[PDB]
Ligand binder design. Structure first.
Ligand code: HEM
Ligand code: HEM
Ligand code: HEM
Ligand code: HEM
Lengths: 283, 283, 283, 283
């Protein structure tokens, strides 16, 4: 089985941590201290491509975050290790992060972190509902979980310009998203650049279905959406990001008019075994 | 012809600005206010790959910062426009940044900025001399300036861990860089991982000579080196970075033990016409 | 008559906003848009001493945060207006801050804000339960609410050093607080510097009882406690603060070993009428 | 005998450090590492009132930064120790800051830091010349240095609103400062609220002369003026600050329209001996 990547009572808070491998000499000491804490429910783990190449192994399906030569900027800030903390107590995530940061401190240094929260029941700070057309029970498992229970997650930290977006007329805001804010109805007559029209999961030659487990965030860098896209492989995420960037037809997604990603990373989520997390292909 | 990006009377302070193209409709209005201010001496301009693709043009040799599938992390955060301010008055550069930011307001939003300074007469906060094996005048013009007067500049914001690096014995510090700090003399018996052994400009299939116009920086993100590599094209910088990343010999550069890059970008510096900067291949 | 300063089921999140009066000419336009939003439950209001001086009025019992010439540092950063936002959704409070800053735009500018949350059910990030010896029910109206529904609130933003505190032995942590962490029982044999020994509400003349409604916080300034002390006037808070600073017996509270306040302010919470909040003593 | 607080060629860069006394037991070991480095030229020393109270000593003339019950906000953020770094190399001050906090670490913790610079030859970021009517030559020693080598310095970190100030008509800007920007001539017909009208050194009951050694600053907190007022006592600064706040006549200084202080502190600068700094009244 995988990790608790699909539990439908999604916690009110999240904490994403990203680590750089600085000293591979003390890496075994850090992993022996880390793996017994990964239960897949409150602490989830993803392995990056630099961590695979550092250990000489190559996990099937894993590769760095792609480089898209487009008119919009999708930065590739690939890290070695990704920790995903989920809980209802915002203080509990903070206290463990200080424990985890000290736990891996010889081998891994903290490169970036995001204090996430679930706005209302699941919304982006812009007011639009996030997760409407997300698949549900078992439809998630076909889309997000691989044959062996591993999953492949794409991470992007999007920074919103909430002041500029909320200053536009509602009719123009709706043409940017592709759905009406008042009742969450798809705008059939929206421009081709509308977000829902760009990412229509049924509008690809494989039904590029993914599971989105994003949360909202806010700190000194501003505020936006911590986008997390799970897939049985990275192709569902990548073909959509290429269409959003105008690399398929020349039409760029409307989200880039008010929001831009600061971070980009691909991570392999190993399966959950009976002794713990299954990092056997990597050790 | 060329810009004054090589004048060895180097100013004491620098400011690097990076912009994202958010509304291409107002782009001509922004270019009209910017180009008359770019004299190549106190204000330099660099065009990014997304800016060319946004205009449907194709500059030969221009492409985004590469994506290296290596054991160390070299991020690619390519932006549309790069502005390089150089001056002796740190406050003057600050006031000009707010002026530039308002003049490009609707079309380009400020994505990243770096407050740089020339440490001592040219050293890295670690104390080592920076620019020792840099080519000099006339010897530079063939190595750093392209055939048509334009240059291809690579930018990386490196973040030092001065506390850890300066906590190591003086012998280990010298083996990481490859030179003795006391007199800046190459250690021929250093390990193959030494930075100077990795970056020996004569040990490539062309003598990959570049011009390094780097400055030190310090703000809330920490402190380090704002690396700037000029070249007649990007091959010199790329073959160097691949060897440092262990993509050529499997030996990783020792810089990654204490320093890591946060950003990465390729930029095309257009030649100076006599109207000003020559953006003819872009119109 | 009072605001909802005493409701026991404390919401999971809070936001404290502090404003400086920049343009008193636009104050009438700002107050008419702000006062109908103060219900005392989800938005609470406190008036600072500078706001009284700006209107030439004199509120009985109101004054700036005191100046303690002590061996410890208690800052006095008194502001004009204090807005206290309470809610269960961390995202809603953030969006209302952007709404509140604009409605008060020309007259009042944001001087400081705090993103607060109730750790567990009411605990300090150090793990100790906060609010054990708070008064119960009507005893809080006797101690925190003045004659006319109004209250006098003291605000301090304390910054913890959780790394240092958690490294001490458990008995040293217990001797600093004055309670044992394992069962939350008072250490009668604790040193005179233990926090509970310093602020024992019955050990003063007269009995300095207050109601504390503090929440935990964490951002780029660190993490700590947003201390809020409610009293029928400021004498209870001040006499306790003076004993903690050693101005009564020479013994400094043990909290200053790992925590220090960053801000300090006295505010007058006006009574709640059936038309709204009563600013008649201020017009 | 005095420190170099009056040298006319003021260095291009400054760095102000402020420390909180956390463990007074390790204070001797910290002072033993600090006093041999205080030469009064590149590293200057100011002692705060809390440091005197912690040692049970009492310096004549020293007291905490006052608390002014006015309509404007002047914070009192007194600290135990003030270190003033001056130099022409911005990077040298950065490295000494890490070295200093390392040496004073167990006893004193860093409470605040400012990265200052001298804009032009002595201007405020608004463009007005700063330091015109500072006394010169022999007149500074009678105004800034007491009967012994000691001076008494007041520090305030003012945060400017450069965007708002430069949007005002030039005559409104001139009426706020009280001097014309075109030639730096006093406007005798300016309103009584003009800054130069409030602080006219010869319009007090003694000719309240002080020596101002302020620099400009700019970081994440914004930008403004790091105000440093030197006097043989705090009486010159205090009576002026009280007039600017409208506590003497009711007229508030025009600086508060666009600028506000973030910090406030009084510091005693000990006399300089030929063995070091003389802290004998402190032992
Ligand atoms: C700031 C960034 C983003 C925001 C605010 C955002 C928000 C939304 C919203 C409001 C919807 C409509 C409601 C729903 O169907 O869930 C939606 C749909 C969707 N989004 Fe985005 N999203 C963002 C980034 C992305 C990215 C980077 C991708 C993929 C690379 C993506 C993929 C999708 C998909 C597949 C749908 C399904 C809609 C459908 O098929 O009907 N989103 N998003
Ligand atoms: C933390 C980042 C860096 C530090 C601290 C650093 C510092 C140094 C130092 C001290 C030297 C020896 C003296 C000198 O040439 O100035 C050197 C050599 C050199 N470095 Fe770097 N550098 C950094 C990044 C880079 C990168 C990323 C590249 C190329 C991709 C580069 C290219 C070179 C070259 C071409 C030399 C020539 C040395 C020779 O040919 O003997 N530098 N570096
Ligand atoms: C970082 C700052 C502070 C922390 C972490 C803290 C924490 C605590 C804790 C854990 C207790 C024991 C449990 C309880 O009675 O709630 C306590 C007691 C108390 N504290 Fe604090 N406190 C802080 C600041 C203050 C300040 C500044 C004051 C007053 C000026 C204060 C007033 C009190 C009072 C009145 C009690 C009553 C305890 C008794 O009567 O037994 N607290 N505090
Ligand atoms: C953001 C804060 C401040 C700014 C931008 C500022 C700027 C100026 C300027 C441009 C002048 C005219 C030329 C000069 O004397 O330098 C001046 C005059 C003066 N300033 Fe300020 N000042 C500030 C704060 C203060 C404060 C708080 C005090 C005293 C408590 C003070 C003391 C004085 C005095 C005594 C003069 C007399 C000059 C004369 O009589 O010719 N300054 N100020």
């Amino acid at each position: 089985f995988q990790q608790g990547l699909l539990a439908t009572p999604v916690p009110a808070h999240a904490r994403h941590l990203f680590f750089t491998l600085q000293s591979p000499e003390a890496l075994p000491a850090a992993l022996d201290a880390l793996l017994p804490q990964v239960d897949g429910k409150q602490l989830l783990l993803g392995v990056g491509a630099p961590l695979a190449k550092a250990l000489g192994r190559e996990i099937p399906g894993l590769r760095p975050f792609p480089l898209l030569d487009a008119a919009v900027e999708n930065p590739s800030t690939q890290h070695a290790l990704w920790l995903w903390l989920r809980g209802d107590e915002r203080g509990d995530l903070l206290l463990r992060t200080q424990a985890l940061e000290q736990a891996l401190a010889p081998a891994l240094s903290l490169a970036d972190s995001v204090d996430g929260f679930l706005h209302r029941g699941g919304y982006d700070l812009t007011g639009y509902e996030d997760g409407t057309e997300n698949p549900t029970d078992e439809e998630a498992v076909q889309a997000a979980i691989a044959a062996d229970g591993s999953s492949f997650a794409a991470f992007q930290l999007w920074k919103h310009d909430l002041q500029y977006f909320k200053s536009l007329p509602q009719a123009d805001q709706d043409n940017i998203i592709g759905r009406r804010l008042s009742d969450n109805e798809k705008l059939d007559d929206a421009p081709a650049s509308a977000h829902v029209k760009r990412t229509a999961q049924e509008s690809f030659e494989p039904e590029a279905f993914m599971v989105r487990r994003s949360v909202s965030w806010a700190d000194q860098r501003g505020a936006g959406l911590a986008f997390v896209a799970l897939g049985k492989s990275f192709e569902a995420f990548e073909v959509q990001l290429r269409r959003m960037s105008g690399l398929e037809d020349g039409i760029i997604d409307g989200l880039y008019r008010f929001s831009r990603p600061l971070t980009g990373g691909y991570y392999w989520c190993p399966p959950m075994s009976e002794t713990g997390v299954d990092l056997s292909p990597l050790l």
